[PDB]
Amino acid sequence: PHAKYLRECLSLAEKSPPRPTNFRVGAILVSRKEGDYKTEDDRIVSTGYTMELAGNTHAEQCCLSNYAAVHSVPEDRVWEVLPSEPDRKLVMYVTMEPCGKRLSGNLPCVQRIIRTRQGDRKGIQKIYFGVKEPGSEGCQMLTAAGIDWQVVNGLEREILEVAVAGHENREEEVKAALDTL
Numbered sequence: 670p671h672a673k674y675l676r677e678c679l680s681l682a683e684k685s686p687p688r689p690t691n692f693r694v695g696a697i698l699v700s701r702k703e704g705d706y707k708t709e710d711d712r713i714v715s716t717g718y719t720m721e722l723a724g725n726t727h728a729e730q731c732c733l734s735n736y737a738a739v740h741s742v743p744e745d746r747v748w749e750v751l752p753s754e755p756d757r758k759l760v761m762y763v764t765m766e767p768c769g770k771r772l773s774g775n776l777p778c779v780q781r782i783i784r785t786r787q788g789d790r791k792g793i794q795k796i797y798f799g800v801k802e803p804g805s806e807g808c809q810m811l812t813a814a815g816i817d818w819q820v821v822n823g824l825e826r827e828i829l830e831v832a833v834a835g836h837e838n839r840e841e842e843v844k845a846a847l848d849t850l
């Protein structure tokens with residue numbers, strides 16, 4: 670089921686405008702029953718893709734921002750309105766490892782994820798992703814804050830090719846990232 674979710678994330682990423690500099694990524698926020706869950710019981714809470722929303726926005730950021738907007742709060746307050754049911758957990762699928770730093774200085778996605786766990790709200794408890802960030806790691810920052818994560822293998826070339834489609838060095842870029850496997 671995790672690979673199926675990442676393929677849906679890939680479809681979202683394909684809506685991203687290809688830019689010579691951005692990484693085209695898709696993200697899906699899922700509410701899942703604790704225990705031996707049936708995917709049929711999964712609920713899609715929100716979705717996002719790179720630059721879906723005005724400005725220099727990441728997939729995970731748009732995912733949270735879309736939900737925030739529907740609930741009449743800014744994204745930095747999305748933790749207040751996300752579901753926090755006793756029998757369910759929030760997990761986020763994203764094609765690429767969430768960023769731990771952004772060159773622009775904007776708040777990194779790992780921090781947007783971590784800050785969903787505030788007050789009595791459980792927040793996002795696990796991230797599934799398909800490729801590590803190509804090129805302090807986001808995954809280490811998630812661990813340090815108690816956010817679980819898991820790499821879902823098998824889709825690396827496809828995720829990377831979509832992500833760097835707008836780049837001029839895109840063939841060398843994918844080959845380098847696949848070499849790190």
Ligand SMILES: [Zn+2]
Pocket residue numbers: 727728729767768777778779
């Ligand atoms: Zn990011």
